[PDB]
Design a protein around this ligand. Structure first.
Ligand SMILES: Nc1ncnc2c1ncn2[C@@H]1O[C@H](COP(=O)(O)OP(=O)(O)NP(=O)(O)O)[C@@H](O)[C@H]1O
Ligand SMILES: [Mg+2]
Length: 335
């Protein structure tokens, strides 16, 4: 169409862009690298992420999104626009309709922020959409139906657990503890235990290469190495971390995630629980990819837990699909 329909997943880690009629057309890190002095945009997306932690003092790589919402406005807006444009296929004649996914536990203020940043980013109409709602839609689960559907979305910034029914959220919990809060634990684990400082990115790699949360032979045998600075000798050092240590280091966070899942269920009308029980808890979100998280989750709850088919792209998909799911689009907040 002359007016492209965009579903935007503006996350703190990755920003996915869905385009009605063609699938996923933008899929890159929510990072912006500028010139620390002039204020010029150098690169955005993957090229800017690779910059993080390896930049001079004359460059500032910024993660404008923090904890699901806009941490640095004008920066977020500038990023939101690039990604939107890169998607639009190039300046169209008519401003697109945008559905940007947001976390459930967002204040009225953090809300208008994204609504205003969606308009300044060049959009005709902007709707907001709870992330786990889109996540569910973006997986073809019938959210319009009157039957419980529990979703556990663990992104880079926030962990949202939602119980969905009749096109809307019945109960939920949203902690600001997820993917990024995990990297740090790992980073701080190496610092505090091996007295060696590593980078936010080597940690992410560790989180991704051997991140697990359930004790098993396969897992315990896992190993990768980290190269940083030995804070005891100020000498570049390279040490080896085993899966058992990472699991243990991610514990504190893994527990918060689990606690909020428990809490949520505890306050869900029994009729839904009866459903969720036979149906299963849905696990999605980049940060939910930890090894054995479903097993662990399924254990603590006692309910089958099912990993999504495509977690990284489940919100972008939904946010865009909710456009042709008009019975649900009516209940969203717009601008
Ligand atoms: N294989 C993996 N194992 C564990 N964690 C991973 C893995 N792959 C990616 N991640 C992490 O997941 C986070 C991003 O998850 P993602 O679903 O893209 O969320 P987000 O949209 O960026 N943020 P949010 O606003 O919380 O939805 C980053 O912290 C990644 O390090
Ligand atoms: Mg997500």
């Amino acid at each position: 169409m002359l007016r492209k329909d965009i579903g935007i997943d503006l996350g703190t880690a990755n920003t996915l862009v869905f385009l009605r009629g063609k699938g996923i057309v933008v899929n890159e890190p929510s990072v912006i690298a500028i010139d620390s002095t002039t204020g010029e945009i150098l690169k955005v997306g993957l090229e800017a992420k690779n910059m993080i932690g390896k930049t001079p003092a004359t460059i500032k790589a910024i993660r404008p999104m923090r904890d699901g919402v806009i941490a640095d406005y004008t920066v977020a807006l500038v990023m939101l626009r690039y990604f939107i444009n890169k998607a639009k296929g190039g300046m169209n004649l008519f401003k697109p309709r945008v559905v940007i996914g947001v976390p459930i536990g967002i204040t009225d203020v953090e809300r208008r922020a994204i609504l205003d940043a969606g308009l300044e980013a060049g959009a005709s109409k902007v709707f907001l959409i709870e992330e786990p709602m889109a996540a569910a839609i973006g997986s073809n689960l019938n959210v319009e139906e009157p039957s419980g559907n529990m979703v556990v979305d663990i992104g880079g910034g926030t962990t949202e657990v939602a119980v969905i029914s009749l096109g809307s959220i019945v109960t939920w919990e949203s902690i600001r503890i997820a993917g990024d809060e995990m990297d740090e634990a790992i980073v701080q684990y190496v610092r505090e235990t091996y007295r060696v400082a590593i980078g936010e990115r080597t940690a992410e790699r560790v989180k991704i290469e051997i991140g697990n949360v359930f004790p098993s032979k396969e897992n315990d045998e896992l190993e990768t190495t980290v190269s940083g600075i030995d804070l005891s000798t100020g000498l570049p050092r390279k040490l080896t971390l085993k899966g058992g240590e990472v699991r243990e280091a991610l514990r504190s966070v893994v527990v918060a995630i689990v606690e909020s899942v428990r809490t949520t269920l505890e306050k869900t009308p029994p009729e839904l629980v009866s459903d969720i029980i036979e149906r299963g808890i849905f696990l999605t979100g980049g940060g939910s990819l930890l090894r054995g998280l479903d097993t662990l989750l399924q254990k603590e709850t006692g309910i089958s837990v099912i990993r999504s088919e495509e977690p990284l792209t489940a919100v972008a998909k939904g946010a865009g699909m909710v456009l042709d799911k008009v019975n649900i689009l009516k209940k969203l907040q717009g601008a």
